[PDB]
Amino acid sequence: KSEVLNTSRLKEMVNPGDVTAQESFQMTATMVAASNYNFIIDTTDHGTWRRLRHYRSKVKFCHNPDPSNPYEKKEDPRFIHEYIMDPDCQNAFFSILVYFWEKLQKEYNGQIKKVFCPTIESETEAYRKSQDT
Amino acid sequence: LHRFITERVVESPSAETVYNLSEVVTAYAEWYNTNINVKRHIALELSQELENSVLEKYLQWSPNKTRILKGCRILHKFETLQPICEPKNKWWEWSPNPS
Ligand SMILES: Nc1ncnc2c1ncn2[C@@H]1O[C@H](COP(=O)(O)OP(=O)(O)O)[C@@H](O)[C@H]1O
């Protein structure tokens, strides 16, 4: 279902500092969240809502395609049932990732905040206009 | 939820207000408790399937940028409208392709 995201635990999963277990260790991991339903955010401090990014998918994958609508296409469940276990696909994907990382390093000098995207930080601020009861 | 809409909401002729938006989930909670089972619900997301339901054509907008209803009546209890085959002996034979 939809879930509520507690403002707690956010700082220590977003911060680059050491976090304890109580064993302490430095944590470095790119974090991603996706759901079919919406989240609940109740905060307005600039400390939060600034290390957050939001996007919304527009396309829809379904068996019976609807013509004249670019936001829908026929789905290929095979992409899920198989195409993961193939070594060749994983090799190609790994090559794509390393190429993209090298491109980022040579362009923006390893800085993700320097990169430019108009839709991002525009949809995100619109989401920030929500979640304020 | 579709059954609840059919039971508690029928097309009102006229002289009916928008009932705001929380009335639908408020009535649906008690209807679900008294019909299927008792359990809590979160009203925020329950609104979306209302647009996903048949009430899409009748979910009007409001000057306060809220969702209101039209052509609706809050019914209750007993209120009226108020206007292939079989093979010879071997099914394990699998038959031809249609089977
Ligand atoms: N580009 C594509 N072309 C064809 N089929 C796709 C494509 N992308 C995804 N699909 C198929 O559409 C389905 C999407 O379902 P899923 O990934 O479970 O969506 P969600 O995670 O939102 O439920 C997948 O099973 C996948 O096989």
Coordinates of C-alpha atoms and ligand atoms in Angstrom, one line a residue:
Chain A
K1 CA 0.0 0.0 0.0
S2 CA 1.0 3.6 0.5
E3 CA 3.4 4.1 3.3
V4 CA 4.5 6.8 5.7
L5 CA 8.2 7.7 5.8
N6 CA 9.3 8.6 9.3
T7 CA 11.5 11.7 9.3
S8 CA 13.8 9.6 11.6
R9 CA 16.6 7.5 10.2
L10 CA 16.7 9.8 7.2
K11 CA 19.7 11.8 8.3
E12 CA 21.9 8.7 9.0
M13 CA 20.9 7.1 5.7
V14 CA 21.6 10.3 3.7
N15 CA 24.7 11.6 5.5
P16 CA 28.2 10.7 4.4
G17 CA 29.4 10.4 8.0
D18 CA 30.0 7.3 10.1
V19 CA 27.0 5.3 11.3
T20 CA 26.9 2.8 14.1
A21 CA 25.2 -0.6 14.2
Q22 CA 26.9 -0.8 18.3
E23 CA 29.7 -1.2 15.7
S24 CA 30.5 1.9 13.8
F25 CA 31.4 2.1 10.1
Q26 CA 31.6 4.5 7.2
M27 CA 28.6 4.0 4.9
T28 CA 28.7 4.8 1.2
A29 CA 25.8 3.4 -1.0
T30 CA 23.6 4.9 -3.7
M31 CA 20.1 4.5 -2.5
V32 CA 16.9 4.1 -4.7
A33 CA 13.2 3.8 -3.9
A34 CA 10.3 3.0 -6.2
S35 CA 6.7 2.2 -5.6
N36 CA 3.3 2.0 -7.3
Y37 CA 1.8 4.2 -4.5
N38 CA 2.7 7.5 -2.9
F39 CA 4.7 8.2 0.3
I40 CA 3.9 10.4 3.3
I41 CA 6.3 13.3 4.1
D42 CA 5.7 15.6 7.0
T43 CA 8.5 18.2 7.3
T44 CA 9.6 21.5 5.9
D45 CA 13.1 22.1 7.3
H46 CA 15.7 23.0 4.7
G47 CA 18.0 20.3 6.1
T48 CA 15.6 17.7 4.7
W49 CA 13.7 18.2 1.5
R50 CA 17.0 19.3 0.0
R51 CA 18.8 16.0 -0.2
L52 CA 15.7 14.5 -1.9
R53 CA 14.9 13.9 -5.5
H54 CA 11.5 12.9 -7.0
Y55 CA 10.4 11.7 -10.5
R56 CA 7.2 10.2 -11.9
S57 CA 7.1 7.6 -14.7
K58 CA 4.8 8.5 -17.6
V59 CA 4.7 5.4 -19.8
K60 CA 2.6 2.3 -19.2
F61 CA 3.5 -1.2 -20.3
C62 CA 0.4 -3.3 -21.0
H63 CA -0.4 -6.3 -23.3
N64 CA -2.9 -4.5 -25.5
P65 CA -1.3 -1.3 -26.9
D66 CA -3.4 1.8 -27.4
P67 CA -2.5 3.6 -30.6
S68 CA -1.9 7.4 -30.8
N69 CA -0.8 7.5 -27.1
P70 CA 3.0 7.7 -26.8
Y71 CA 2.6 7.2 -23.0
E72 CA 1.7 3.5 -23.4
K73 CA 3.3 0.5 -25.1
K74 CA 3.1 -3.3 -25.2
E75 CA 5.0 -4.9 -22.2
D76 CA 7.5 -7.7 -22.6
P77 CA 7.3 -9.8 -19.5
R78 CA 10.1 -11.8 -20.9
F79 CA 12.3 -8.9 -19.9
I80 CA 11.6 -10.0 -16.3
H81 CA 11.1 -13.8 -16.5
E82 CA 14.4 -14.0 -18.4
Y83 CA 17.1 -11.7 -19.9
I84 CA 18.6 -11.3 -16.4
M85 CA 20.3 -14.7 -16.3
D86 CA 22.1 -14.1 -19.6
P87 CA 25.8 -13.3 -19.1
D88 CA 26.0 -11.3 -22.3
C89 CA 23.2 -8.9 -21.3
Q90 CA 25.0 -8.3 -17.9
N91 CA 28.3 -7.7 -19.7
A92 CA 26.7 -5.2 -22.0
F93 CA 24.9 -3.4 -19.1
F94 CA 28.2 -3.3 -17.1
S95 CA 29.9 -1.7 -20.2
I96 CA 27.1 0.8 -20.4
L97 CA 27.5 1.7 -16.7
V98 CA 31.3 2.1 -16.9
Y99 CA 31.0 4.2 -20.0
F100 CA 28.4 6.5 -18.4
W101 CA 30.5 6.8 -15.2
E102 CA 33.6 7.8 -17.3
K103 CA 31.5 10.3 -19.2
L104 CA 30.3 11.9 -15.9
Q105 CA 33.9 12.0 -14.6
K106 CA 35.2 13.7 -17.7
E107 CA 32.3 16.1 -18.0
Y108 CA 31.2 17.2 -14.5
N109 CA 34.4 16.2 -12.7
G110 CA 32.6 13.6 -10.5
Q111 CA 30.0 16.1 -9.3
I112 CA 26.4 15.0 -9.5
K113 CA 25.0 18.4 -8.3
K114 CA 26.6 20.2 -11.3
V115 CA 24.7 18.2 -13.9
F116 CA 21.7 20.0 -15.4
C117 CA 18.2 18.6 -15.8
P118 CA 15.2 20.9 -16.2
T119 CA 12.5 18.3 -15.4
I120 CA 14.4 17.4 -12.2
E121 CA 14.2 20.0 -9.4
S122 CA 11.1 21.2 -11.1
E123 CA 8.9 18.1 -10.5
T124 CA 10.8 17.7 -7.2
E125 CA 9.8 21.2 -6.0
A126 CA 6.3 20.5 -7.2
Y127 CA 6.2 17.4 -4.9
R128 CA 7.6 19.6 -2.1
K129 CA 4.5 21.8 -2.7
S130 CA 2.6 18.7 -1.7
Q131 CA 3.2 16.7 1.5
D132 CA 2.4 19.9 3.5
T133 CA -0.9 19.4 5.1
Chain B
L1 CA -15.7 -0.3 -3.4
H2 CA -17.7 -0.6 -6.6
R3 CA -20.4 -2.6 -4.7
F4 CA -20.5 0.1 -2.1
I5 CA -20.9 2.8 -4.7
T6 CA -23.8 0.9 -6.3
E7 CA -25.5 0.3 -2.9
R8 CA -25.1 3.7 -1.3
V9 CA -24.9 6.0 -4.4
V10 CA -27.5 6.1 -7.2
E11 CA -28.0 8.9 -9.7
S12 CA -29.8 11.7 -7.9
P13 CA -32.2 13.7 -10.0
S14 CA -31.4 17.1 -8.5
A15 CA -31.5 19.1 -5.2
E16 CA -28.3 17.3 -4.0
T17 CA -25.1 18.9 -2.8
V18 CA -21.5 17.9 -3.5
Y19 CA -21.2 16.2 -0.1
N20 CA -17.6 17.4 0.0
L21 CA -15.1 14.5 -0.6
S22 CA -14.5 12.8 2.8
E23 CA -18.1 11.6 2.9
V24 CA -17.4 8.8 0.4
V25 CA -14.5 7.3 2.4
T26 CA -16.4 7.9 5.7
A27 CA -19.4 6.0 4.5
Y28 CA -17.2 3.3 2.8
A29 CA -15.4 2.6 6.1
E30 CA -18.7 1.7 7.9
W31 CA -20.0 -0.1 4.8
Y32 CA -16.9 -2.3 4.6
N33 CA -17.0 -2.9 8.4
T34 CA -20.7 -3.9 8.3
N35 CA -20.5 -5.9 5.1
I36 CA -17.1 -7.7 4.7
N37 CA -14.9 -7.2 7.7
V38 CA -13.7 -4.6 10.2
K39 CA -10.2 -3.0 9.6
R40 CA -8.6 0.4 9.4
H41 CA -8.1 2.4 6.2
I42 CA -6.1 5.4 5.2
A43 CA -8.3 8.0 3.6
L44 CA -5.7 9.8 1.5
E45 CA -5.1 7.0 -1.1
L46 CA -8.7 5.8 -1.0
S47 CA -9.6 8.9 -3.0
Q48 CA -7.6 7.8 -6.1
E49 CA -9.7 4.8 -7.0
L50 CA -12.8 7.1 -6.9
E51 CA -11.4 8.7 -10.0
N52 CA -10.5 5.2 -11.2
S53 CA -14.1 4.2 -10.5
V54 CA -17.2 5.1 -12.5
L55 CA -17.4 8.3 -10.5
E56 CA -14.7 9.8 -12.8
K57 CA -17.3 11.5 -15.0
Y58 CA -19.0 12.9 -11.8
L59 CA -15.9 13.9 -9.8
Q60 CA -16.1 17.7 -10.3
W61 CA -13.5 20.3 -9.4
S62 CA -14.0 23.1 -6.9
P63 CA -12.9 26.8 -6.7
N64 CA -10.9 25.8 -3.6
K65 CA -9.0 23.4 -5.8
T66 CA -10.6 20.4 -4.2
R67 CA -12.6 17.4 -5.5
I68 CA -16.4 17.6 -5.1
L69 CA -19.2 15.3 -6.3
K70 CA -22.2 15.8 -8.6
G71 CA -25.3 13.8 -9.5
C72 CA -25.0 11.9 -6.2
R73 CA -27.2 10.8 -3.3
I74 CA -26.2 9.3 0.0
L75 CA -28.5 6.3 0.1
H76 CA -28.8 3.9 3.1
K77 CA -30.5 0.7 4.1
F78 CA -33.5 -0.3 1.9
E79 CA -34.0 3.1 0.2
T80 CA -35.5 2.8 -3.3
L81 CA -34.4 4.7 -6.4
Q82 CA -36.3 7.8 -5.1
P83 CA -36.8 9.6 -8.5
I84 CA -17.2 -28.6 -24.0
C85 CA -17.1 -32.2 -25.1
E86 CA -15.8 -35.6 -24.1
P87 CA -13.7 -38.1 -26.1
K88 CA -14.5 -41.8 -26.8
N89 CA -12.6 -43.4 -23.8
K90 CA -9.2 -41.6 -23.5
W91 CA -9.1 -38.0 -22.4
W92 CA -5.4 -38.6 -21.6
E93 CA -5.1 -39.1 -25.3
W94 CA -5.0 -35.3 -25.3
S95 CA -7.4 -35.1 -28.4
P96 CA -6.3 -32.9 -31.4
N97 CA -4.9 -29.5 -30.8
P98 CA -8.2 -27.8 -29.7
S99 CA -8.5 -30.7 -27.1
Ligands
LIG1 N1 11.0 -1.2 -23.1 C1 10.2 -2.3 -22.9 N2 9.7 -3.0 -23.9 C2 8.8 -4.0 -23.7 N3 8.4 -4.4 -22.5 C3 8.9 -3.8 -21.4 C4 9.8 -2.7 -21.5 N4 10.1 -2.3 -20.3 C5 9.4 -3.1 -19.4 N5 8.7 -4.0 -20.1 C6 7.9 -5.0 -19.5 O1 6.8 -4.4 -18.7 C7 6.7 -5.0 -17.4 C8 6.5 -3.9 -16.4 O2 6.1 -4.5 -15.2 P1 6.9 -4.1 -13.8 O3 8.3 -3.9 -14.2 O4 6.5 -5.2 -12.8 O5 6.2 -2.7 -13.4 P2 6.1 -2.2 -11.9 O6 7.4 -2.5 -11.3 O7 5.8 -0.8 -12.0 O8 5.0 -3.1 -11.4 C9 7.9 -5.9 -17.2 O9 7.5 -7.2 -16.9 C10 8.7 -5.8 -18.5 O10 8.9 -7.2 -19.0

